Structure formats: C-alpha cells, structure tokens
Design a protein around this ligand. Structure first.
Ligand SMILES: Cc1c(N2CC[C@](C)(O)[C@@H]2C)ccc(C#N)c1F
Length: 249
C-alpha cells in the first residue's frame, strides 16, 4: 500500500481564498480573490510535489519548472475533484470561501472556461473515479508538460513519469479477471488526463491576457503569480513547453 500511503498522506488540506463573500460579486473582486487563491494553492503544490516519491532525483531547477508548468492543470484537477466531492459538480469549488455559482462564472468573465472545468468535474462522477485513481492521476499530471527542448536532466524525469504511469496502471478500478475491463479503464483515465491540458491552456491564455490588462482593471496579481504568468506561461502558449499527451491531438 506504500505508494498510495504516500499520496493520501501528503494530499494537501483545505486552502481558503480569503474571499469576502459578504460584498457585491464583481469581476475585480472575483479575480483578485482567485489570484490570491492561485498564489496559496501554488505554495501547497510546491510542498506537495517535493514530498512526492522520487521527486528529488530531478535537478533543482527542473523541479521548480515542472511545478511551474504543471501548476494550473493540477489546481484545476484538484479543484474539479473538490467540486465533485463537495457539491456534486453543480458549482466550482475553488475554496470553501470561494464557490462559483453560474452568476459568479459570468461575473468572473470565465464562463467559457468554467464550463469546461465543470465538465471535467462531472467526468469524475460519470467515470466513478476512485479517490485513489484521482491521486495517482493528479501526481501524474505533475509530470505531463515539459520544454520540447528537454529538461536540465531528462533521464530522471522519464524514469519518474514511467514509474508514475506504472503506479496508476496497478490501481485502476477494474476486473483483473477480465482483459477488456482494465484495458478499457486505462483508456478512459488517460483520456481524462489528456482532457485536462486544453483546459489548462485556456486558463493560461486568460490569466496571461488578464495579467497584461491588470494595471487597467485593478485586479491584484501576487509576487509569484506575475512571475510565473509572465515568464513560464508564455513558453507554454508559444509552443516551447508542451504537454505530454497519451493520445494524439
Ligand atoms: C484556476 C484556479 C485559479 N486561478 C488563478 C489564476 C487564474 C487564471 O485566474 C485561475 C482561474 C486560482 C485558484 C484555483 C484553485 N483552487 C484555481 F483552480
């Protein structure tokens, strides 16, 4: 049980946004609160990642980058799970103090993207994704997007990803006395992982675009946000850093 012992043991607790629920819903407040939530969620992903099995084989700057490139898809992924498990995918459960209803979806101007993220949530229920399946997939997300140019030491990354792909394959919810079953379960879960990437890309696009006009619209971006968004995110949007897909796109 050792691998999943780890994952569950290091799975972060509740991160609040700091949001002031008892004021008017508005774009500037909704998005200033998400940027503080993203900033906090980051700090936790950092410690979560660093405690992952085998993670510190990676070169130190690879570690940071990997985290930076994966940070949005992971947040989104875990977010969707919170929304699955807390509200049964009706609303987006960013935080206990930041739960997006339809109305906030519109006011945040992220309706198109919230829709996708919510669809994602619903897949968890449709597919009856087990909590165990969720953690393994989420851990695997960390290792699903790299510079095409390669990492400072790619050898150890491939070894981890391979090993993390292996661990998910053991734990899939399936009839082991039936070929088609586990075969089928894997395919589904791989597709689901793949489906996280286009959504992350949309959020990147939006946050980046948003950052550029942040001075105008007075949406506050934290230290590490602006650092990531202006430096790492554009590499992804420029096609320098690409997601590792299971299936061809
Ligand atoms: C997508 C996202 C967050 N933000 C932060 C950056 C963004 C593009 O504005 C994006 C919508 C922030 C926090 C959680 C959490 N938990 C999250 F899932």
């Amino acid at each position: 049980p050792i691998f999943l012992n780890v994952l569950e043991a290091i799975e972060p607790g509740v991160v609040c946004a700091g949001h002031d629920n008892n004021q008017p819903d508005s774009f500037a407040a909704l998005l200033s609160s998400l940027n503080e939530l993203g900033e906090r969620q980051l700090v936790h992903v950092v410690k979560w990642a660093k405690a992952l099995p085998g993670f510190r084989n990676l070169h130190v700057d690879d570690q940071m980058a990997v985290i930076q490139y994966s940070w949005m898809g992971l947040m989104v992924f875990a977010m969707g799970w919170r929304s699955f498990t807390n509200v049964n995918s009706r609303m987006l459960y960013f935080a206990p103090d930041l739960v997006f209803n339809e109305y906030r979806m519109h006011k945040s101007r992220m309706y198109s993207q919230c829709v996708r993220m919510r669809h994602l949530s619903q897949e968890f229920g449709w597919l009856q994704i087990t909590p165990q399946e969720f953690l393994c997939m989420k851990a695997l997300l960390l290792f699903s997007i790299i510079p095409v140019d390669g990492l400072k030491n790619q050898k150890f990354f491939d070894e981890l990803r391979m090993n993390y792909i292996k661990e998910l394959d053991r734990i899939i919810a399936c009839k082991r006395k039936n070929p088609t079953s586990c075969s089928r379960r894997f395919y589904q879960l791989t597709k689901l992982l793949d489906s996280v990437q286009p959504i992350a890309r949309e959020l990147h696009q939006f946050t980046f675009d948003l950052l550029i006009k942040s001075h105008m619209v007075s949406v506050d971006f934290p230290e590490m946000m602006a650092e990531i968004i202006s430096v790492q995110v554009p590499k992804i949007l420029s096609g320098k850093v690409k997601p590792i897909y299971f299936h061809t796109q």
